[PDB]
C-alpha cells in the first residue's frame, strides 16, 4: 500500500502561519523526492517546488519564495509545508506528490513525473472565524416520490469554511446518494444539501441518518430524517 | 509546458488530441495528468509516451517541435475531465510548470431531461427563525440548466443561490431560495421553474 496521507483542513486568519503535513507509507521515504502543488479555487495546478528527502534541501518554484518553507521529519517519513504571513489569496488545496526523475535519451537531460499523490489539504485564510453547520431534515413526501421510490435528504446550512463531508447511516448507504456542491450566500456562509433515494416502502421500517462532519469547527451532527 | 487550449470537444468513439506548446518542450518531455471534478490528479503519460500500468491503452502521448500532445482513441464518457501537461519551464535553473489545463467535453451521450424535486422549509428550520426552499435538479445529459424562482404567481430573484452541474454518468445541480417564516405562510405558494434545452419544468410547494 504505497500512499501519501495529508493533514486535515484548516482555517487561519490573515497574517498567521500554517503547517501542513504529508506522511509517506509503503516505501522508503528518503529514496524519492517530494513536491508540492497548489490549486486555488477555480484555477489550475501550480508547481510550488520540491524537497530532497535524502538531504532536506528545498528548491522553491518561481513565485513561492520567502513565506513558504519545506521541511521533513524522516524519522516518521513525513514532509512538511509551512506558509507564513498568510494572505486571503493563499486559500487553496495543497497537494504533496512523489516527484520522480529519470535520465532522458539526450545527455544532460531528464524526464520527471508525479506518480503518487496525496489527497490534498484545504487551507482557508479569512478574517471570519469558523461557524458550525445547522442541519435540517428534508423529509420525504408525495412530492418527493415517484413510483416506488422516495427522496429524502439533509440541508446543511450556514457553515464556514469549506469543506463538510456527509455520509448516510455512517457510510452504510452509498447507492442512490448524491451530495450537491455547496452554495455561497451573500452573508459569506456556505450551505449544501445531500439526498438519498430509497424504497418508499422502507420509510416506515428503516432508519435513515445523515452524518455531517465539519472539521474546521470540530462539529459532527447526526440527523435522522423521517416522514411528516 | 506553457500554453494549453482552455476547452476541447469530442464525440463518443472519435479521437481527440490535447496539445501543449512551449519552448522547453523542444528539449524536455512532458507528463500528462487527468483531474476529474473534486478528485486528485492522476498520472496518465510520462516521458512523452510511457503509460503507467493502470492507464487504459486509449491514452497516447506524442511530441513535435515545441509541442507535446495527449491523444485519446476510444473516447468515452468517463474521459470528460481536465487534462494538464507538466514539464520544465524556460528558466536556466531547473524549474517546472503545469500547463493551464484543457477541459474535455465528450459530445453525443444519451440525452436525458432533468428531474426536479422541491422541498419546503422544515418545521424545525421555521422554529429557528429561518425558512429555506430547496430545489434539486438531477439526471440531465446536456449539462447546462437555467433556474427561475416564483412567489405565488409573481417572480422572485431576491434570495436565490444556485450551483453548477456535476456527474453522479448523468449530471445534477441544485438551487436555493432563502426566506423568513412569516413570508412562507404569507404567500400561497412558491415554485421552482427549471429550463433545460427547450423544455421547462415547474414544481410548487405551499404552507398547506
Amino acid at each position: 500500500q504505497v500512499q501519501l496521507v495529508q493533514s486535515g483542513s484548516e482555517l487561519k486568519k490573515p497574517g498567521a502561519s500554517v503547517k501542513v503535513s504529508c506522511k509517506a507509507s509503503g516505501y522508503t521515504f528518503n529514496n524519492y523526492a517530494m513536491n508540492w502543488v497548489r490549486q486555488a479555487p477555480g484555477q489550475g495546478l501550480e508547481w510550488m517546488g520540491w524537497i530532497n528527502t535524502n538531504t532536506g534541501n528545498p528548491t522553491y518554484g518561481q513565485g513561492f519564495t520567502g513565506r513558504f518553507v519545506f521541511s521533513l521529519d524522516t524519522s516518521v517519513s513525513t514532509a512538511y509545508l509551512q506558509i507564513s504571513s498568510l494572505k486571503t489569496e493563499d486559500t487553496a488545496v495543497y497537494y504533496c506528490a512523489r516527484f520522480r526523475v529519470a535520465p532522458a535519451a539526450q545527455r544532460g537531460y531528464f524526464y520527471y513525473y508525479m506518480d503518487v499523490w496525496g489527497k490534498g489539504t484545504t487551507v482557508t485564510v479569512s478574517s471570519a472565524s469558523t461557524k458550525g453547520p445547522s442541519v435540517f431534515p428534508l423529509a420525504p413526501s408525495s412530492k418527493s416520490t415517484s413510483g416506488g421510490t422516495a427522496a429524502l435528504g439533509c440541508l446543511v446550512k450556514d457553515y464556514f469554511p469549506e469543506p463538510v463531508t456527509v455520509s448516510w447511516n455512517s457510510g452504510a448507504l452509498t447507492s442512490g446518494v448524491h451530495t450537491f456542491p455547496a452554495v455561497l450566500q451573500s452573508s459569506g456562509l456556505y450551505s449544501l444539501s445531500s439526498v438519498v433515494t430509497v424504497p418508499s416502502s422502507s420509510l416506515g421500517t428503516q432508519t435513515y441518518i445523515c452524518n455531517v462532519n465539519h472539521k474546521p469547527s470540530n462539529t459532527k451532527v447526526d440527523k435522522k430524517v423521517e416522514p411528516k | 509546458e506553457l500554453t494549453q487550449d482552455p476547452t476541447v470537444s469530442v464525440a463518443l468513439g472519435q479521437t481527440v488530441t490535447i496539445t501543449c506548446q512551449g519552448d522547453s518542450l523542444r528539449w524536455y518531455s512532458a507528463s500528462w495528468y487527468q483531474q476529474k471534478p473534486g478528485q486528485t490528479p492522476v498520472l496518465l503519460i510520462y516521458n512523452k509516451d510511457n503509460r503507467p500500468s493502470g492507464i487504459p491503452d486509449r491514452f497516447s502521448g506524442s511530441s513535435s517541435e515545441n509541442t507535446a500532445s495527449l491523444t485519446i482513441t476510444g473516447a468515452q464518457a468517463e474521459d470528460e475531465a481536465d487534462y494538464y501537461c507538466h514539464s520544465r519551464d524556460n528558466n536556466v535553473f531547473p524549474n517546472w510548470v503545469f500547463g493551464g489545463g484543457t477541459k474535455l467535453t465528450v459530445l453525443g451521450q444519451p440525452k436525458a431531461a432533468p428531474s426536479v424535486t422541491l422541498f419546503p422549509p422544515s418545521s424545525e428550520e421555521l422554529q429557528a427563525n429561518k425558512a429555506t426552499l430547496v430545489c434539486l435538479i438531477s439526471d440531465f445529459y446536456p449539462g447546462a440548466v437555467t433556474v427561475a424562482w416564483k412567489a405565488d404567481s409573481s417572480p422572485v430573484k431576491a434570495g436565490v443561490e444556485t450551483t453548477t452541474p456535476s456527474k453522479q454518468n448523468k449530471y445534477a445541480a441544485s438551487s436555493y431560495l432563502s426566506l423568513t417564516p412569516e413570508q412562507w405562510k404569507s404567500h400561497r405558494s412558491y415554485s421552482c421553474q427549471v429550463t433545460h434545452e427547450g423544455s421547462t419544468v415547474e414544481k410548487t410547494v405551499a404552507p398547506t
Binding site: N30, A33, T53, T59, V101, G108, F110 | V92, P94
Partner: peptide, 29 residues
Amino acid sequence: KNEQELLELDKWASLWNWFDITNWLWYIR
C-alpha cells in the same frame, strides 16, 4: 544510487546546457 542524485546533477547540467547552447549559437551564427 539514490534517484534524487539525478536532480542534483540536473542543476549543474542545466547551467552548462545554457552555457553550451549560447556559445554554440554564437559560433554558428
